């Protein structure tokens, strides 16, 4: 589990095809990861309902991944939640693509909605030479 750099993560996400995935430019995804986890792939947050949020994009164990300890995990991304704490963002990015395609866009992420939606997201990739 590592803390990525901003341009480091922008480059990895660009490579994985997130740029304009579902109409969302890259700065959206980099802003969302900054505010969801401060770029830390190992972050976990436990919730009052017994679900936990895993990794760089704080993906929740009730809906998206299965950790074994969560009431009625749908496991919609078909992954163990531990896969989402790896230094390699691949599992997180592929599950994030199912989440943004679920019908509510990037609004599935509370941090994106509060801290990124409606701000200038272009700044999050400035300087990166992508």
Swiss-Prot record:
Cysteine disulfide links: 7-128, 31-116, 65-81, 77-95
Source species, domain of life: Eukaryota
Subcellular location: Secreted
Source species: Phasianus colchicus colchicus
Identification of the protein by name: Lysozyme C
Molecular function (Gene Ontology), one example: lysozyme activity
Domain C-type lysozyme: from-to ranges: 2-130
Gene3D superfamilies to which the protein is assigned, alphabetical: 1.10.530.10
Entry similarity comment: Belongs to the glycosyl hydrolase 22 family.
Record: active site: 36, 53
PANTHER family xref list: LYSOZYME C
GO cellular component, one term: extracellular region
């Amino acid at each position: 589990g590592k803390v990525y750099g901003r341009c480091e993560l922008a480059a990895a996400m660009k490579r994985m095809g997130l740029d304009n995935y579902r109409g969302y430019s890259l700065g959206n995804w980099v802003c969302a990861a900054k505010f969801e986890s401060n770029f830390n792939t190992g972050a976990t947050n436990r919730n009052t309902d017994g679900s936990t949020d895993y990794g760089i994009l704080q993906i929740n164990s009730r809906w998206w991944c299965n950790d074994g300890r969560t009431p009625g995990s749908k496991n919609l991304c078909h992954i163990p939640c531990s896969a989402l704490l790896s230094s390699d963002i691949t599992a997180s990015v592929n599950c994030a693509k199912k989440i943004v395609s679920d019908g509510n866009g990037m609004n599935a992420w509370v941090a994106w909605r509060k801290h990124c939606k409606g701000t200038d997201v272009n700044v999050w990739i400035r300087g990166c030479r992508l």
